[PDB]
Design a protein around this ligand. Structure first.
Ligand SMILES: [Cl-]
Ligand SMILES: [Cl-]
Lengths: 130, 129
């Protein structure tokens, strides 16, 4: 049938203590993680996709077939945001490497990191996290 | 400046032991309490506003300039939910009384109390509760 994703409420917590909720689709399967947000033409400002690699290891992301400009947050197993790549470029096959082992990647609309005042070292929290 | 409130994670804890997390904005001076949730057209199911009266006394609420239907929970200083008025009516000037003295009111989307299985006697916990 139609591809489905588990959804969940997560929150970004910043160093200032500010909290902001998001609704994310969980990309768990290999096909879900590879398809990512390909072909989607819209996505609400507080919605994103949380890629759950099921292990801690470096990861590689790209923008192949992706129309929405995105911010990418590379996240440790304890929810710490290690690095952030803002304004990934639609359609680009340039690899964006995590540069170090991580457990998750959060993709949000481009500009979301700025809108929410998020920085590396801030945290994502939710059901499995930390 | 953009209107802001201190914004907190709080948790409803039912008598049966179930927990439900929320993020609430804190209305803590007279102007904030009198204007809390006016104008808003949308609010997530797990969001609300916590009105902090700075003391324990009878309180009075209404729905002037309020577009969202809301559930009101009247809460003691220790976080115990004393009474609940579900399904307050957008724009209604009807005055909703705690009757007894309380320290807080939590406003949620209408129907939230029923959806979460919350009752009088249940508890709200957070930083400060
Ligand atoms: Cl801040
Ligand atoms: Cl779409």
């Amino acid at each position: 049938g139609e591809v489905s994703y588990a959804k969940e409420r997560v929150r970004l917590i910043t160093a200032s203590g500010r909290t902001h909720d998001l609704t994310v689709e969980l990309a768990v399967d290999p096909s879900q993680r590879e398809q990512g947000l390909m072909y989607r033409r819209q996505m609400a400002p507080d919605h994103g996709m949380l890629f759950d690699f099921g292990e801690t290891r470096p990861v590689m992301m790209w923008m192949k077939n992706t129309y929405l400009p995105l911010d990418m947050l590379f996240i440790a197993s304890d929810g710490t945001i290690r690095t952030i790549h803002e304004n990934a470029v639609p359609h680009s096959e340039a690899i964006i490497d995590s540069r170090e082992p991580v457990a998750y990647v959060l993709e949000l609309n481009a500009g979301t990191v700025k809108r929410l005042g998020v920085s590396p070292g801030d945290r994502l929290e939710g059901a499995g996290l930390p």
